[PDB]
UniProtKB/Swiss-Prot annotation:
Self-association state and partner proteins as the record states: Interacts with TASL; leading to TASL recruitment to endolysosome.
Main location: membrane
Name this protein carries in UniProt: Solute carrier family 15 member 4
UniProt organism field: Homo sapiens
GO BP terms, alphabetized: dipeptide import across plasma membrane; histidine transport; innate immune response; L-histidine transmembrane export from vacuole; mast cell homeostasis; monoatomic ion transport; peptidoglycan transport; positive regulation of innate immune response
Localisation per UniProt entry: Lysosome membrane; Endosome membrane; Early endosome membrane
Gene: SLC15A4
Tissue expression: Highly expressed in skeletal muscle. Moderately expressed in kidney, liver, and heart. Weakly expressed in colon and brain. Expressed in low levels throughout the gastrointestinal tract and in Caco-2 cells. Expressed in retinal fragment epithelium (RPE) and neural retina. Expressed in small intestine, stomach, duodenum, jejunum, ileum and colon.
InterPro entries, per the entry: MFS_trans_sf (IPR036259), POT_fam (IPR000109), PTR2_symporter_CS (IPR018456)
GO cellular component: early endosome membrane; endolysosome membrane; lysosomal membrane; membrane; plasma membrane; specific granule membrane
Amino acid sequence: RAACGAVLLTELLERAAFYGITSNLVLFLNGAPFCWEGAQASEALLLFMGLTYLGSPFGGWLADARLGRARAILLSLALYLLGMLAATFAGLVLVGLGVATVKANITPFGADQVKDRGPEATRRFFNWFYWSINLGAILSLGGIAYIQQNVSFVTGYAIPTVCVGLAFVVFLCGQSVFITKPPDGSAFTDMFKILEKVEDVKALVKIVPVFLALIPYWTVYFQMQTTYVLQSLHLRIPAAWLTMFDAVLILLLIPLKDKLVDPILRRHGLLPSSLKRIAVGMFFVMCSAFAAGILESKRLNLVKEKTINQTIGNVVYHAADLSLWWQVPQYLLIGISEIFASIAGLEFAYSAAPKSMQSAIMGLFFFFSGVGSFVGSGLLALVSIKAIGWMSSHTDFGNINGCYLNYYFFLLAAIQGATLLLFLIISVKYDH
């Protein structure tokens, strides 16, 4: 239909711009634009990310009553372009709000273009949606690297600006064929305060427990991502490309997963719902945490005998004799888990959402994921205390050797176990 293609393309540019912003924010804010403190840039980026996570439910509400699911995205992209065409705190707030609204509004609108075909069509569209997001991240990183290398640094913001602008142009061009739904609502507040609209309230209350189950999984996922990024510099490597291993792996795996799982699972006749797929993803996170803990424990045991100097980046991280390739099973497990879990959870959040406020539900889901990321950061901060020990190295970039991480990984695995059991209980209660 090419409408899903245009939606995917717009998501590609939006994700590319957002990932470029997140990667290069602190480097740009190193001190040239009157922010000359590492903590001041760190809190600026943290505030930007927190507002991005917080504004998604509000972006969904704005697309519930005032505007539809197309005018809202167009206005969000206009705000995006204005922000990248811009004291700076107001601009950062504008950019964060635009990102939140566009992220919370594209996905349900994208699934709406194909919903009539069938539930399997929605699953295929969401698979390709996540694939497009990851390809956008990879392309953004490669493009900014190529531009900063071949061309001078004067065009640093140029790539995000052209990405956002091109997204606006393709969205405007596609609007002529896109399928749109008129907005309605603002008549549900009195329904859940007394204790089709009644069944809507029942669906709304039944949705929440699965999100309360999913949030600690989000904390574990974000903490695991950060710890893997921080660990890969301490293994013998034969800038910031170490955070794209998962992206490359899932980019290579998603088409293979589709063509080599869905036809056979459909053929076998035992194709499960989304909750089972989320449970499988959490089980693979379990296995990933166990494998990472084992690998890091062996690396620390080898470090205790001798160390090897490394000079990756501007820091002088001291590495071990283990090659970086030894982390391939870890990232393979985490990629399989991501494919089986994130896509399934997104599909369930879209499908089980009320037929009239899908955008609000998806925004709430994204806000819950962000709150989980914050909870995981708080857990990392709590663990670093001297009363319990474990991680005891922050400095400017840290030195993990001589500091415990195996117990941290196994704590992550145990938290994942508790969450998996609790989510299994809620899934049984939901589908029974």
